[PDB]
């Protein structure tokens, strides 16, 4: 995120980090419950990637993080890789996340919900902070 | 990428106003936000766009794509969760 602000640790409890065997943070994801991860399809997750939960600082050696194995990758077949339309993949965990003060689920909308233009919403991430 | 978790507040825009910037690139299952002085960037993909409704944070977008450059004058394109949520319900249901 460009022009963000540092979040209050443990405050976006559903915010996971996608990392590779190497330990490289490659995309983000959101917990929708204890066994299930939501992310983009273009992030190209595989079963050797690790879902990392309860992170604030990828630099810390002292946080109580969970490194969780991916069992299955559910790529929405309505994903149109040329278009980048319907960009969503579900990731089923091999080991259920343990819910805590810092690991929790985000709520999902029902398909018939309205989110009007001009509404102030919030985005989180470990994205480039400057281009 | 920064070590520390960042956040940013920003506005949803309409698809219409959104094709004022992205045109035919903007499809039905995508939702736009930003162009506010903040921008999602490389490294944010898959991460959430949350709006609070009746006291709780609802997943309204999934960070998808935008300005090659993370221009903060260019709106970010996100996945539109309302359009994909039945697929999610259908998937959790089967497996």
């Amino acid at each position: 995120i460009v022009n963000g602000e540092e979040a209050v640790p443990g405050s976006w409890p559903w915010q996971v980090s996608l990392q590779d065997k190497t330990g490289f943070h490659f995309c983000g994801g959101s917990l929708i419950n204890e066994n299930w991860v939501v992310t983009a399809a273009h992030c190209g997750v595989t079963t050797s990637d690790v879902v990392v939960a309860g992170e604030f600082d990828q630099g810390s050696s002292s946080e109580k993080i969970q490194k969780l194995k991916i069992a299955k990758v559910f790529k929405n077949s309505k994903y149109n890789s040329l278009t980048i339309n319907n960009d969503i993949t579900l990731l089923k965990l091999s080991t259920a996340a343990s819910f805590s003060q810092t690991v929790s689920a985000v709520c999902l909308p029902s398909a018939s919900d309205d989110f009007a233009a001009g509404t102030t919403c919030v985005t989180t991430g470990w994205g480039l902070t400057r281009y | 990428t920064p070590d520390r978790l960042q956040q940013a507040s920003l506005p949803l825009l309409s698809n219409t106003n959104c094709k004022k910037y992205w045109g035919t690139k903007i499809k039905d299952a995508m939702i736009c936000a930003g162009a506010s002085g903040v921008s999602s960037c490389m490294g944010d993909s898959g991460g959430p766009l949350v709006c609070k409704k009746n006291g709780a944070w609802t997943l309204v977008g999934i960070v998808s794509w935008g300005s090659s450059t993370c221009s903060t004058s260019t709106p970010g394109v996100y996945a539109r969760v309302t359009a994909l949520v039945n697929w999610v319900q259908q998937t959790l249901a089967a497996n």
Binding site: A7, V8, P9, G10, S11, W12, P13, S100, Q101, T102, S104, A105, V106, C107, L108, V122 | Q7, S9, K52, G55, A56, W57, T58
Partner: peptide, 10 residues
């Protein structure tokens, strides 16, 4: 869901 145990401060 949706109600962090530690309040996001904006």
């Amino acid at each position: 869901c949706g109600v962090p145990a530690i309040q996001p401060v904006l």
